[PDB]
Write a protein that binds this ligand. Structure first.
Ligand SMILES: CCCCCCCCCCCCCCCC(=O)O
Lengths: 61, 255, 60, 281, 59, 61, 255
């Protein structure tokens, strides 16, 4: 039971190349590093507010 | 809402002025500046329009307001002749057309008083101190350095008559208000913004020969404050050209 | 003297100063300019050889 | 399509010759005006009667890829097994491609060049003569460390720098197949520039030439083992292979020998070899 | 790293008017400057820092 | 997810032999050299003209 | 038809060159210059595009072709630094991008002979006469005045090696033809027109530091004529910028 996934490739002038991975061990610890996952969320640090602040309005009014 | 009408942000080009005390903005004669149409064209050659490169806030020199000082004037477009690429385009082109956002800045604490008239007079032709004499260029403008009014009638040879109360052109100063004006009365606002559109009797003109309008700043109520509460309060005039377009390209020069 | 104290962070303004006087100046080049060298942004930057983006300086 | 997809190909073959016959026409296919800067498109059938020939020749060793993609030696560096007191116990090389003559000439045929690279490194060791040159020693491991621009630099064979917490390193034991890495594209521009005509300073000064753009870090080499009772000298030969190449703007090949590796300086040479006479059999 | 090829220009600050105060108040005051990276920013080519070093193992 | 493609083989007297390739790495850089692609276009160099020139007609007329 | 392909009229801005003998026009690498797209932008600020004001034929200095003379080169965009509003925009902006129409003009009567190569070499990095030395600015360009080649190997200190046959950069002169070129062979045509598009490895660049390409004019067959048939024949190089756009506005200067 192989898994297929897309390789990192840059942009091009105005695509998809796959690679194959199979796990050979019984413990999830033995698996390769998870280097693909670029999700983020600055929210928790950059705006830890209770009341929402609208950018265009004055901060204190 | 969350809005207040005392805060305003004007962004034009790569230059933004903010102000947190102001009273509205006067659009000269109700009309917002815009490009020349094809019904009012006279020149046949294709105009250049430099857009962002020549529209942006040029901060001119700032003079200090003192208790005894009588007032200041600058002449446009003449004043802008050394300001960046505006200056250059004006230097290499026979004809130019543009409107202007005049933004006068001043500020003080609560324990100061004083009130200045800020007025844009179109076509201000000025007298001469000697009434048989004739004024010459150097006493009409110093470029971007303010020309001072005087409170003493006598003046040098080729002096311009500049006794405050007659506005330097033989009309009672109290009537200057008919032209687009604001007042910076220290206690309420602390800035004036006049959006002056292009007003002339002909569609485009030469930028050197003709002087479209004069910005006069006259203190009607003198600056005063009680002892030991600062003594230096400057007045900074910042102006931005709008919709500038130029026809007739030839070699640089005046003559 | 001021660098080993709290003085370092506060830029001194004064009343009755002529208009058009420079308060301060330094060339922008984070992670190699002393001013931004050891700030949060600076510290992160010094683990990389290439940066890109826009910087925002909030004056209070 | 994509030049990093290597299983996707294309096929084309060299043009055929179509049979022609004698003419006495009013059209001239072999008169042209060089001045135009236009190369004539004459084909043999325009000035001879040719037979019909089918060509199945295919240009296939003159593709840019096939031309450039062979591993060239770029530099070799030498270092002894020593202590901290020695200043030859480790060594380093500032990365450049201008040291060797052969590969340099190949690359310089294109103004702009964009590629990924396979770096292979062959490290060979030899026993130095000494009184105790019949001393026994076990196998030696070598460490190759890449230091990107503006990183810490070793001052001795043994200091903190060699910890390599985020610097790529290869540990290679002797008697194994040569160490090999692949490196992606790594410029801050959109292609490597083999020629830069310009100055490092806006006042038209400083450094003239390609030097200004190149900056790629350095390779530090050392032995991992503690010293034996006699020195062993090692020499590492670095091989580079450009793969997935794309090339823009062809230039004339080099004619004069190189002199320096920081500039294009040359001294003028004859255009071509002399021959006996203007008529020669 | 500082390099002559790439520079990022000069940030300067100037008095547009002046600081004005009332009667009984301190003449000198202070401003402070925050710095951060905008929402479009990125970094490449991971490498060691130069702000820490040792000469032996810590104990 | 294997890929199949045709090997280089010469002409024959009056065919197709495949090979198999699978990628094992997560970065497109690690892939084998793209040695098959014989596309070309002399046009840009041999005729960089604005006005088309017909071979059979005189160059200047 | 009534057309001939020997007459051509190029009008760009307020400047028209006509020519009645020419052989076509070489569009460099098949691509016509055009403005930067939004897929290849890096700068965030709004570009200025001065259009008609900065696109037009700038006639640079003209040197005399003589029997013994060995050749001339000029470096672009550096050469255009004093040409009108192109110069000014280039002076006040950090980044610039533009293509160019190079039009070399020369003429003679039927009883003259001689043939010049006209070639636009992108990225011509040049040697140094002293091979331990390093060339400096003043021997790389004289602005809009032509830099001469030499036919004698020896040269001054900070001289550039400029022996004709190695093109001043260590390659056989006979192969220069690989770059966009024409020939003015006196008998057929009498002008060359190369429309060189912007070629660089990065979308825009600083106009002072980088020199995009060098225009080399090399006489392969010497000028010759029989006695008493005029002795002065100049070569005039006229160049027009196309699609010029500038980002990054700040005060004028070099440093
Ligand atoms: C142990 C890790 C080693 C990593 C090595 C990184 C090597 C970077 C190589 C850069 C090659 C640059 C080629 C430049 C070509 C040119 O313009 O002449």
């Amino acid at each position: 039971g192989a898994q297929v996934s897309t390789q990192k490739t840059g942009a091009h002038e105005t695509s998809i190349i796959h690679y194959t991975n199979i796990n050979y061990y019984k413990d999830a610890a033995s698996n390769s590093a998870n280097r693909q996952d670029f999700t983020q969320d600055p929210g928790k640090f950059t705006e830890p507010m209770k009341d929402v602040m609208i950018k265009t309005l004055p901060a204190l009014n | 809402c969350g809005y207040s009408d005392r805060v305003r942000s004007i962004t034009l080009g790569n230059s933004t002025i903010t102000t947190q005390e102001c009273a509205n903005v006067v659009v000269g004669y109700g009309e917002w500046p815009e490009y020349l149409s094809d019904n009012e064209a006279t020149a046949e050659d294709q105009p250049t329009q430099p857009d962002v490169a020549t529209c942006r806030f040029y901060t001119l020199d700032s003079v200090q307001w003192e208790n005894g000082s009588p007032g200041w004037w600058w002449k446009f477009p003449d004043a802008l002749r050394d300001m960046g690429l505006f200056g250059q385009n004006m230097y290499y082109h026979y004809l130019g057309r543009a409107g202007y956002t005049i933004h006068v800045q001043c500020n003080a604490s609560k324990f100061h008083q004083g009130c200045i008239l800020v007025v844009c007079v179109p076509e201000a032709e000025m007298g001469s101190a000697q009434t048989s004499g004739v004024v010459n260029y150097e006493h009409i403008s110093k470029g971007e350095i303010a020309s001072r009014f005087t409170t003493t009638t006598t003046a040098e040879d080729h002096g311009v008559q500049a006794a405050v109360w007659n506005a330097g052109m033989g009309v009672g100063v109290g009537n200057l208000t008919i032209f687009p004006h604001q007042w910076i009365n220290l206690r309420t606002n602390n800035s004036a913004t006049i959006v002056m559109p292009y007003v002339n009797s002909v569609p485009m003109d030469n930028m050197y020969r003709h002087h479209n309008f004069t910005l006069m700043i006259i203190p009607f109520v003198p600056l005063d404050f009680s002892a030991g509460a600062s003594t230096y309060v400057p007045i900074t005039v910042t102006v931005a050209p709008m919709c500038a377009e130029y026809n007739g390209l030839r070699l640089a020069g005046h003559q | 003297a001021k660098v080993s104290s709290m003085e370092a962070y506060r830029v001194e303004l004064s009343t009755n100063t002529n208009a058009g006087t420079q308060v301060f100046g330094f060339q922008l080049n984070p992670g190699a300019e002393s001013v931004m060298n050891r700030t949060l942004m600076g510290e992160i930057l010094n683990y990389y050889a290439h940066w890109s983006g826009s910087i925002k300086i909030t004056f209070v | 399509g994509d030049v990093q997809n290597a299983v996707e190909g294309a096929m084309v073959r060299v043009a055929d010759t179509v049979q022609t016959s004698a003419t006495n026409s009013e059209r001239v296919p072999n008169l042209t005006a060089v001045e135009t800067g236009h190369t004539s498109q004459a084909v043999p059938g325009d000035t001879m009667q040719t037979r019909h020939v089918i060509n199945n020749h295919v240009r296939s060793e003159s593709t840019i890829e096939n031309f450039l993609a062979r591993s060239a030696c770029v530099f070799y560096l030498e270092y002894k097994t020593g202590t901290k007191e020695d200043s030859n116990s480790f060594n380093n090389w500032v990365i450049t491609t201008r040291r060797v003559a052969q590969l340099r000439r190949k690359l310089e045929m294109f103004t702009y060049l964009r590629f990924d690279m396979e770096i292979t490194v062959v490290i060979t060791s030899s026993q130095d003569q000494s009184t105790s040159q019949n001393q026994n020693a076990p196998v030696l491991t070598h460490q190759i460390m890449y230091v990107p621009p503006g990183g810490p630099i070793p001052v001795s064979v043994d200091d903190y720098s060699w910890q390599t917490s985020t610097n790529p390193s290869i540990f290679w034991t002797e008697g194994n197949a040569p160490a090999r890495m692949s490196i992606p594209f790594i410029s801050i521009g959109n292609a490597y520039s083999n020629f830069y005509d310009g100055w490092s300073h806006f006042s038209q000064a400083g450094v003239y030439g390609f030097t200004t753009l190149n900056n790629m870090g350095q390779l530090f080499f050392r032995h991992v083992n503690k010293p034996n009772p006699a020195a062993i000298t090692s020499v590492a030969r670095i091989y580079f292979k450009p793969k997935h190449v794309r090339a823009w703007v062809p230039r004339p090949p080099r004619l004069c020998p190189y002199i320096n590796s920081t500039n294009v300086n040359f001294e003028p040479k004859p255009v071509t070899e002399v021959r006996t006479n203007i008529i020669t059999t | 790293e500082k390099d002559p090829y790439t520079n990022a220009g000069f940030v300067t600050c100037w008095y547009q008017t002046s600081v004005v105060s009332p009667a009984s108040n301190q003449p000198k005051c202070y401003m402070m400057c925050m710095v951060s990276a905008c929402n479009d920013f990125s970094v490449r080519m991971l490498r060691d820092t130069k702000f820490i070093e040792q000469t032996s193992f810590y104990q």
